[PDB]
Structure 1
Amino acid sequence: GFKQDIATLRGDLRTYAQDIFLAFLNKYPDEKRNFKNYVGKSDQELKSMAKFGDHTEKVFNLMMEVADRATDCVPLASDASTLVQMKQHSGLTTGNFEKLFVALVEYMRASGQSFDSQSWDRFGKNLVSALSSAGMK
């Protein structure tokens, strides 16, 4: 289920984080705007941009903590505020997070693994809702 999935992802987090974030940027190429340095780069190229591996892993480190502290795929309001109140998310809307979670769920669906993809989809919905409530537009 969801908790085991957090363990699975954490066991190879660098690899999952890159592959899911790349799935996100390739499904929604306009989202590369948020990361100028990423434009005109193949996946392999991105995977050798220091900022890429480090921002991606830090995104997934914190996403797995927020997932771990959730009850029934509902994140802590305190975690939602943090994501809203981060200066680097100033430009962001819940739409940015929507699309990340659509790509993550689709990645899990297409994987050969028994990810609880329905739980991740509810998690993404609930986090978007929490982000709105915490003041993201």
Structure 2
Amino acid sequence: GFKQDIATIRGDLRTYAQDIFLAFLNKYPDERRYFKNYVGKSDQELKSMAKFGDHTEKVFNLMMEVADRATDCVPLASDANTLVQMKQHSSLTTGNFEKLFVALVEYMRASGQSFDSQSWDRFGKNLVSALSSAGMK
């Protein structure tokens, strides 16, 4: 289930973080406009960029905490508040998050793995709802 999936991802965090973020960027290439120096590079090129590995691990480190702190895939309002208020997230709207979780869910479905993809979809939708409540447009 969802709780076990958190442990699975955490067990191989760098690999999962990079592969899922890449699935996001490749499904939604224009989402690269939010980041610096990701455009014009293949997956292997990105994976050899020190900043890429560091960033994506930090994103998924926090995502797993938000998931772990959730009850029945409903995140804490305090977690939503933090994600809205982060300076690094000032250009974002809930749509950016919708797309990330669509990509993450499709990645899980496309694996040969027993991820609880429906729970991640639910969690993504609930997070978007919480971001809206916390004041993200």
Judge same fold: TM > 0.5, yes or no.
Answer: yes
Q: Which runs of 4+ in 1 moved over 4 A?
A: none
Instruction: State the aligned residue count.
Output: 137
Unaligned runs of 5+ in 1: none
1:114 aligned counterpart, secondary structure: coil
5 Å matches for 1:1-137? 1-137=1-137
Deviation track 1:52-78 (CA, whole Å, cap 9, x = no partner) reads 101100000000000000000000000
- Alignment TM-score, normalising by the size of structure 2: 0.99
Deviation track 1:6-44 (CA, whole Å, cap 9, x = no partner) reads 000000000000000000000000100011300000000
Indicate the RMSD between aligned Cα atoms, in angstroms.
0.5
1:38 aligned counterpart, secondary structure: coil
Distance across 1 between alignment mates of 2:37 and 2:2: 33
Distance across 2 between alignment mates of 1:95 and 1:44: 27
**What is the Cα deviation at residue 51 of structure 1?**
1.3
Deviation track 1:62-118 (CA, whole Å, cap 9, x = no partner) reads 000000000000000000000000000000111111000000000000100100000
**What is the Cα deviation at residue 48 of structure 1?**
1.1
1:37 aligned counterpart, secondary structure: coil
- Alignment TM-score, normalising by the size of structure 1: 0.99
Unaligned runs of 5+ in 2: none
